[PDB]
């Protein structure tokens, strides 16, 4: 009956807890004792673009590290070069409310998807100077909050109806389906390698996944309240979330239980953006405060702050050579620090 | 400047002659939000005020006095609605539909507005309330089957405020039981405001016709709100 | 892990008393509003009373105002219901409810069909 599953669940999770117990024998804080402070990060705008009318809701760069792409709740698709502060295309879109997007490492297409959970693709290719929609992708059933591309022909989709997706594009139907969280899922991040993936969602949980075979192998709890940005380590071993507790924590895919958490006593307010940078020493968290803050992660202590919104702080991101960093806000406006 | 950047600089001017002309038509059109339960009749005023004109969202287009009106209403849905509600903080009004002729509900719908009324990104949207199924109401009071007394205590000492103005010729009845309900709305929208929004109720029935005529003289009254705040006078 | 148990139910003629008892496990216990919610068996999912952070807000549906007392305990980190005078409509299954954020007033999704921080029940039976 239910009642023997239950008392095997609950024996299942004493055995889980008190295996993961024995394999703390250091605290990183310890180990991390005698590392040098970074010291007093100061950084300032370089350049400010203009042009929207609306909230900034996603952002995303691109392979070359020169050009951008921003999607705003007025209809608007913008594509920008950060070096002279130009327009290279501006997109209209059919639905207002969007709430993703995303450049192809080929330099070829964009991606977006919102509240209407359909996914569009549009080409930047044509002969003509005028960019169409390639395809788009339907089938869940809820609304769309991330999405990254893989290759030119493979996409990976998230909902709010507690599924993920993977959608191969010329032919335009789902290859495999992700089921187990039992909330919304909020966001995303694909290995350096392409082969495994993280997901976490409105409850405190976090998964990984398996993008041939098509099943979870590790999750990991510890938070207290909704998580809201995900990302990945370097080198794939490791991962750092916030939530909508004024708390972001470290975890790793061996060890499978925490190692550092980022708070403080005047904060109380939650995360909304979580980014890594090249070498890993700094990660940078958006705040609804309405800041943003440099932590160091090797010792979890802050090292700079970085102001000038005057609403809240919902994306950012930084380059694949190292050189810069996008802020975008509530208030319209992107800004770019180095 | 080579002849690259002088092109780029041509489309890039060419650009911004488009986006110029985008932001007349998004800044002369006004958004609103549509609420209500399953059992509200939300899509009878749907019907009617398309006279003046699967999917995760829907749209319907309105137009008094040549002023042009949005209205949304959300399906394809889940029941958890803490996520998705925070794209609307930039809306004129919310409005929000009441079904009033089942008293087994109205417990649920109190607790519905409250936490509409006390959330964080909506302190500054304004709502009009509809008080839906006079008609039903009436014949439910006179019948005599149910007790109002039943499901609310303190109505056993309740008498009609001396502003009422039961204009159709009614049992005093029926005009006791529809002010009860407005009264305990009206507490909850006094209480806990800080002069920042308001609140607008109103009493419909399924053959009204002027349901677009009130948003209009209400939106007017937000409106001049803004304005005069904007200004430290308010 | 946000656990929730609940303990004090059990078979009571009319009119008799009992006590409700929620322990807590995997927050801060003071930072957040609780409520209590109950099933009955026919119906969807009510709501019963509620407490704010510190003890010194109440608050009650119609039917529960003269009889049902609300209390907790931020020390111990247990929440409590005592019930006085019982009629048969009152046989349901009763849960404890928390909140979705810390620092806030407003409360989405505490009766939803689905949701994630909810114990599993207890069962009272009044006849």
């Known amino acids: 009956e239910l009642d023997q599953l239950r008392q095997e669940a609950e024996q299942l999770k004493n055995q889980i807890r008190d295996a993961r117990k024995a394999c703390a024998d250091a605290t990183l804080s310890q180990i991390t004792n005698n590392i040098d402070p970074v010291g007093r990060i100061q950084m300032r705008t370089r350049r400010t673009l203009r042009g929207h009318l609306a909230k900034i809701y996603a952002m995303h760069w691109g392979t070359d590290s020169r050009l951008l792409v921003s999607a705003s709740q007025d209809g608007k698709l913008i594509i920008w070069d950060s070096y002279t502060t130009n327009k290279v295309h501006a997109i209209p879109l059919r639905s207002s409310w969007v709430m993703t997007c995303a450049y192809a490492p080929s330099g070829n297409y964009v991606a977006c998807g919102g509240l209407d959970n359909i996914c569009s693709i549009y080409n930047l290719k044509t002969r003509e100077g005028n960019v169409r929609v390639s395809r788009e992708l339907a089938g869940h059933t809820g609304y769309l909050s991330c999405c990254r591309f893989l290759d030119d022909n493979q996409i990976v989709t998230s909902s709010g109806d507690t599924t993920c997706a993977l959608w191969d594009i010329e032919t335009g139907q789902q290859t495999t389906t992700f089921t187990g969280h039992t909330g919304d899922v909020m966001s995303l991040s694909l290995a350096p390698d392409t082969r495994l993936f993280v997901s976490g969602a409105c409850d405190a949980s976090a998964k990984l996944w398996d993008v041939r075979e098509g099943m979870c192998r590790q999750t990991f709890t510890g938070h207290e309240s909704d998580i809201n940005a995900i990302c990945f380590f370097p080198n794939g071993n490791a991962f750092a979330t916030g939530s909508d507790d004024a708390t972001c924590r470290l975890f790793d895919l061996r060890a499978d239980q925490e190692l550092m958490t980022y708070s403080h006593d005047n904060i109380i307010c939650g995360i909304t953006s979580v980014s890594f940078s090249k070498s890993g020493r700094l990660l940078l968290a958006g705040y609804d405060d309405f800041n943003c803050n440099v932590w160091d992660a090797l010792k979890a202590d802050r090292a700079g702050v970085l102001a000038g919104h005057d609403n809240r702080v919902s994306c950012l991101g930084v380059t694949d050579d190292g050189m810069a960093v996008a802020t975008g806000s509530w208030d319209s406006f992107l800004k770019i620090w180095n | 400047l080579s002849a690259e950047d002088k092109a780029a600089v041509e489309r890039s001017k060419m650009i911004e002659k488009q986006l110029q002309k985008d932001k007349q038509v998004y800044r002369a059109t006004h958004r609103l939000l549509l609420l209500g339960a399953d059992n509200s009749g939300k899509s009878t005023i749907v019907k009617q005020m398309r006279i003046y004109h699967t999917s995760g969202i829907f749209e319907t287009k309105f137009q008094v006095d040549k002023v042009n009106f949005h209205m949304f209403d959300v399906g394809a849905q889940r029941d958890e609605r803490r996520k998705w509600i925070q794209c609307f903080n930039d809306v004129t009004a919310i409005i929000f539909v009441v079904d009033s002729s089942d008293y087994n509900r109205l417990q649920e719908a109190l607790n519905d507005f409250k936490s509409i009324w006390n959330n964080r990104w909506l302190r500054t949207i304004s709502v009009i309330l509809f008080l839906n199924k006079q008609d039903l109401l009436a014949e439910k009071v006179l019948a005599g089957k149910s007790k109002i007394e039943d499901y609310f205590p303190e109505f056993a000492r309740y008498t009609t405020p001396e502003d009422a103005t039961p204009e159709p010729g009614e049992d005093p009845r029926v005009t006791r039981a529809k002010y009860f309900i407005r009264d305990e709305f009206l507490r909850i929208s006094t209480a806990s405001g800080d002069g920042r929004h308001y609140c607008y109720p109103h009493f419909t029935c399924s053959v009204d016709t002027e349901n677009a005529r009130r948003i209009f003289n209400d939106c007017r009254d937000i409106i001049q709100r803004m304005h005069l705040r904007q200004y430290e006078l308010l | 892990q946000v656990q929730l148990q609940e303990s004090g139910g059990g078979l009571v003629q009319p009119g008799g008393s009992l006590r409700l008892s929620c322990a807590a496990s995997?927050?801060?216990?003071?930072?957040?509003?609780m409520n209590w919610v109950r099933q009955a068996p026919g119906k969807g999912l009510e709501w019963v009373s509620d407490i704010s952070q510190s003890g010194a807000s109440i608050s009650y549906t119609g039917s529960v105002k003269g009889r049902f007392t609300i209390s907790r305990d931020n020390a111990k980190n247990t929440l409590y219901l005592q019930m006085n005078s019982l009629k048969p409509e009152d046989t349901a299954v009763y849960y404890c409810?928390?909140?979705?954020?810390?620092?806030?007033?407003?409360?989405?999704?505490?009766?939803?069909?689905?949701?994630?921080?909810r114990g599993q029940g207890t069962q009272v039976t009044v006849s």
């Open positions: 409810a928390r909140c979705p954020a810390p620092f806030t007033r407003d409360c989405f999704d505490v009766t939803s069909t689905t949701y994630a921080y």
């Open positions: 995997g927050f801060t216990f003071s930072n957040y509003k």
